[PDB]
Design an enzyme around this catalytic site. Structure first.
Site, PDB file in Angstrom:
ATOM      1  CB  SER A 259     -50.490  48.212  -3.193  1.00 60.34           C
ATOM      2  OG  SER A 259     -50.070  49.496  -2.875  1.00 60.34           O
TER       3      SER A 259
ATOM      4  NE  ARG B  34     -44.379  53.767   2.968  1.00 57.65           N
ATOM      5  CZ  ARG B  34     -44.745  54.289   1.814  1.00 57.65           C
ATOM      6  NH1 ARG B  34     -45.831  55.058   1.764  1.00 57.65           N
ATOM      7  NH2 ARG B  34     -44.016  54.037   0.721  1.00 57.65           N
TER       8      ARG B  34
ATOM      9  CG  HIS C 277     -46.766  48.564   0.103  1.00 60.00           C
ATOM     10  ND1 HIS C 277     -47.656  48.318  -0.925  1.00 60.00           N
ATOM     11  CD2 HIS C 277     -45.621  48.988  -0.477  1.00 60.00           C
ATOM     12  CE1 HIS C 277     -47.064  48.581  -2.079  1.00 60.00           C
ATOM     13  NE2 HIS C 277     -45.832  48.989  -1.836  1.00 60.00           N
TER      14      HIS C 277
END
Lengths: 209, 209
Positions: free
Chosen positions: A16, A39, A42
């Site tokens: 990812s 992040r 993400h």
């Protein structure tokens, strides 16, 4: 019917982040800020959110220093607090959310404001030098600005990321206009939210995977 | 510097839903599904997310009936479980997440799969007739499909909304291809996430404000 998928947890985070790096425009961020960016991307699944991220100049340094120093993370919402991977915090940092403190409703009522806002009156002792994560409630953000204006002690950094259609963009704009001298990070417009905020905190806590 | 903002909690939800209705394309949803749509949009701050929402024909009816019947909500992640406003649940519905059950890591290791996936082995007794909320982990979604394929008892409805870049879209696609006869709702592509999932649950629990 054989389902083929990565059954490996680490492999999943690994692919990812590799994918977000490969698709996300990260050039306008510092290396450090890009970490938060990834992040954060993400967490919401939207590589385009990065266009809405704004990190004041010393936001990550001061917020990372604060956390390494042991500064608590004051959160407007429990969700933000729940998304904070504790094993990542550097110095047994406290993650405080007082939104659910029993006196909050009482206070919201007396002050004529939201519970999310009023809760911040319960931040008093901890405000100074803290890292404020406002991941959901815009009124908590405006209220924090009123406390700052009115002489409240200053947080080391403010994550101004409330999500929403009412006051979310303006509160974040007010923050960016005058944060009373405190480094900040906002997600412009209506985007934000506790997952992205917590992701941001997670990365601040510990950069990289 | 006088900050002007709505200091009223109810007024904030009220203006936000009024705003989402005024900007969100909701025509392709039933009245009932639109309710989920709005809350879901409320939760991510993105009116465009609606384009990615897919509710199988009897998803809301069967999932709302299940909940009114007292069906538990099995959640892949605690965040989803935390976003579920309990006072909204119709029948003291249980909100179970076993992601943190102490045997989960053990299981993930023995089966060669993620903790989110393995946790679902702990769903066994509750699977039947439940409302599954998969708000974060795609492997939990694929794993649930393998359990279904291999004869597991069927949930009354599956919220397939894991967010992510790895397996998120495909797991939701697999769900939509053959959900083994279970109504489903997905957020296509990489979008999804626990806030939106919980919003979805919240609306399923009780429609409207």
């Amino acid at each position: 019917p054989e389902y083929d998928y990565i059954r490996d947890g680490n492999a999943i985070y690994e692919r990812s982040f590799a994918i977000i790096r490969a698709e996300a425009d990260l050039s306008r961020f510092s290396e450090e800020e890009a970490d938060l960016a990834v992040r954060m991307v993400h967490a919401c699944g939207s590589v385009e959110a990065t266009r809405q991220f704004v990190f004041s100049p010393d936001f990550v340094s001061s917020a990372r220093a604060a956390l390494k120093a042991g500064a608590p993370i004051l959160c407007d919402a429990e969700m933000v607090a729940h998304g904070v991977t504790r094993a990542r915090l550097p110095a047994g940092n406290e993650v405080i959310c007082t939104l659910r403190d029993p006196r909050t409703p009482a206070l919201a009522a007396e002050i004529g404001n939201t519970r999310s806002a009023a809760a911040l009156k319960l931040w008093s002792e901890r405000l100074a030098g803290s890292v404020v994560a406002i991941g959901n409630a815009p009124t908590a953000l405006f209220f924090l600005l009123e406390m700052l204006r009115d002489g409240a002690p200053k947080p080391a950094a403010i994550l101004g990321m409330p999500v929403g259609f009412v006051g979310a963009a303006e509160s974040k704009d007010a923050l960016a206009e005058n944060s009373y001298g405190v480094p900040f990070a906002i997600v412009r417009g209506r985007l934000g939210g506790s997952a992205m905020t917590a992701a941001a905190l997670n990365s601040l806590a510990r950069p990289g995977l």
